[PDB]
Coordinates of C-alpha atoms in Angstrom, one line a residue:
X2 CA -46.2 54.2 -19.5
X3 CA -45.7 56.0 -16.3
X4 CA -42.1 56.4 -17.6
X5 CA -39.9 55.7 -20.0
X6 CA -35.6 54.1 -19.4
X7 CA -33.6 56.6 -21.6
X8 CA -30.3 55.5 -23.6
X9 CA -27.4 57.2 -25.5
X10 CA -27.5 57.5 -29.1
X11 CA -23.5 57.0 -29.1
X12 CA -21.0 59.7 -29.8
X13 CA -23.8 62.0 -29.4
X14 CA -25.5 64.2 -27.1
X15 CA -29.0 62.3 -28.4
X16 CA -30.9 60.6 -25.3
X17 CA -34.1 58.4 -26.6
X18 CA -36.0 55.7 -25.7
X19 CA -33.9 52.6 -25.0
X20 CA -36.4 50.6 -27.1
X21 CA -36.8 53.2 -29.7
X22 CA -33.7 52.3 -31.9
X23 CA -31.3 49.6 -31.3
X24 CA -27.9 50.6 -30.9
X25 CA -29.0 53.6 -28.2
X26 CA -27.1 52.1 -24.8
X27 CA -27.9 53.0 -21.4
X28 CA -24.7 54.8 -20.0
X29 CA -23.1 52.6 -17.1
X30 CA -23.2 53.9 -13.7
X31 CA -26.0 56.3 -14.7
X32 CA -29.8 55.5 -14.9
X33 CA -32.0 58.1 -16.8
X34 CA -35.8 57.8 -16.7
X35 CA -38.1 60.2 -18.6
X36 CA -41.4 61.2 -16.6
X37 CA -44.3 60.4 -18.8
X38 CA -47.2 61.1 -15.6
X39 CA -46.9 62.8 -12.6
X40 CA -44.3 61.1 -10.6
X41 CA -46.0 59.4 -7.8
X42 CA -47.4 57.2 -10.8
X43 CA -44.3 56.6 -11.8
X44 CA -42.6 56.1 -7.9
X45 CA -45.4 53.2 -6.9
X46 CA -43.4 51.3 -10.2
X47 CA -40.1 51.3 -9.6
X48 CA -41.0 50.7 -5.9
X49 CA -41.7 47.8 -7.0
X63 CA -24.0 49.9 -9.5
X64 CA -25.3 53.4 -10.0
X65 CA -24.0 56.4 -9.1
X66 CA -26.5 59.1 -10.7
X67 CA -29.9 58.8 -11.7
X68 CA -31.1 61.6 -13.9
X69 CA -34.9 62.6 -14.2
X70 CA -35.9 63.9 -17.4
X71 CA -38.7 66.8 -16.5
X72 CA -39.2 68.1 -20.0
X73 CA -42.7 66.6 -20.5
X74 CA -43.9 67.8 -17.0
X75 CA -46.0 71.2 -17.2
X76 CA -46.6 71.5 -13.9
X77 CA -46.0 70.0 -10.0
X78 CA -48.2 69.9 -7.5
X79 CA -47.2 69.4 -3.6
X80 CA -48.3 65.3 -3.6
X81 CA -45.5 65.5 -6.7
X82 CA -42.7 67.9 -5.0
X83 CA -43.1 66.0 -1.4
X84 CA -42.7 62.4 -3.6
X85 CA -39.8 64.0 -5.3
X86 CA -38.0 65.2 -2.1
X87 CA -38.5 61.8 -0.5
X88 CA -36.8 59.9 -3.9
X89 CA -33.9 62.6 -3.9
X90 CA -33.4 61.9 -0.1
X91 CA -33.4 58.2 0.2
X92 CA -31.1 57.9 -3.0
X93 CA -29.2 60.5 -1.4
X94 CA -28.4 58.3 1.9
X95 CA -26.8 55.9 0.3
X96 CA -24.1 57.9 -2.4
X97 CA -26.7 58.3 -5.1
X98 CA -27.3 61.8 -6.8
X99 CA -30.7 62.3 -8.6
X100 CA -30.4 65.2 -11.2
X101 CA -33.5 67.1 -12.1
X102 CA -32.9 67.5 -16.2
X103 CA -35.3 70.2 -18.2
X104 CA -37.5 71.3 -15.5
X105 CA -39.6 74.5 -16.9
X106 CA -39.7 77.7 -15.3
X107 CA -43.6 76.5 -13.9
X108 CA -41.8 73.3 -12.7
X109 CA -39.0 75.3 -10.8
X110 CA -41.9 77.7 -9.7
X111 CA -44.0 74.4 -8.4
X112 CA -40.9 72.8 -6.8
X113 CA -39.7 76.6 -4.9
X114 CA -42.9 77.2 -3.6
X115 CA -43.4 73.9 -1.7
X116 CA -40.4 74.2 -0.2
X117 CA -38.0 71.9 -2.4
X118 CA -34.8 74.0 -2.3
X119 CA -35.5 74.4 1.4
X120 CA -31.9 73.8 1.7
X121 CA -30.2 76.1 -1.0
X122 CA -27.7 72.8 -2.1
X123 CA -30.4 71.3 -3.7
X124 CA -30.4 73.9 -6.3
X125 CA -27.3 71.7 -7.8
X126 CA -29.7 69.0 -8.5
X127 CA -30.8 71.0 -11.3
X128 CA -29.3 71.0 -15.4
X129 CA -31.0 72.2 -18.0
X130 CA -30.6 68.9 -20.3
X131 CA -30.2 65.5 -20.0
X132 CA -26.4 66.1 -21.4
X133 CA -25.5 68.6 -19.0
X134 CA -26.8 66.1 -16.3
X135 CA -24.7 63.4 -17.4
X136 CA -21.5 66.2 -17.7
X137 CA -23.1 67.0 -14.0
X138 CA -22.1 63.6 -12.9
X139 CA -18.7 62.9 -14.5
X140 CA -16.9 64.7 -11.4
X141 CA -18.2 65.5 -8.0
X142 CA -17.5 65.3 -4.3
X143 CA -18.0 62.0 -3.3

């Protein structure tokens, strides 16, 4: 309820609910969760071999600073151990929201950012280690 494990529909560019229908397949290597309430919900449950894990923003509408310094903390622990978490779908309020408390404080993180889930996924297939 906080979030929601995203699959392949396969041969397609079509990410959905894992449970949703039966023959979408997570992708291996790659772990894509949807953000159905503002991520520090979502954080305190999954607190409780992948190489990317792609956050699907499109149902956010807006960030506030709890949500952006949460975020910053996920991207940098993954980070320290090999791990890349792409931001997917982000709106121009998100971006806005993430920019003004200081998220791209360091300019690199801007490659975090894809406009889809897909292009994520693309994002990932080849990268400096």
């Amino acid at each position: 309820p906080s979030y929601t494990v995203l699959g392949q529909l396969p041969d397609t560019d079509v990410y959905i609910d894992i449970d949703a229908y039966e023959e979408v397949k997570e992708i291996p290597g790659i772990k894509i969760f949807q953000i159905n309430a503002p991520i520090y919900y979502a954080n305190s449950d999954l607190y409780s071999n992948i190489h990317t894990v792609i956050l699907d923003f499109t149902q956010v509408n807006f960030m506030d600073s709890v949500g952006v310094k949460t975020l910053a903390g996920i991207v940098k622990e993954y980070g320290d151990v090999g791990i890349y978490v792409y931001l997917a779908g982000c709106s121009a309020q998100v971006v806005n929201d993430l920019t003004s408390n200081r998220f791209f404080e360091n300019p690199a993180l801007k490659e975090l950012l894809f406009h889809s889930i897909h292009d994520a996924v693309l994002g990932s297939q080849v990268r400096e280690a």
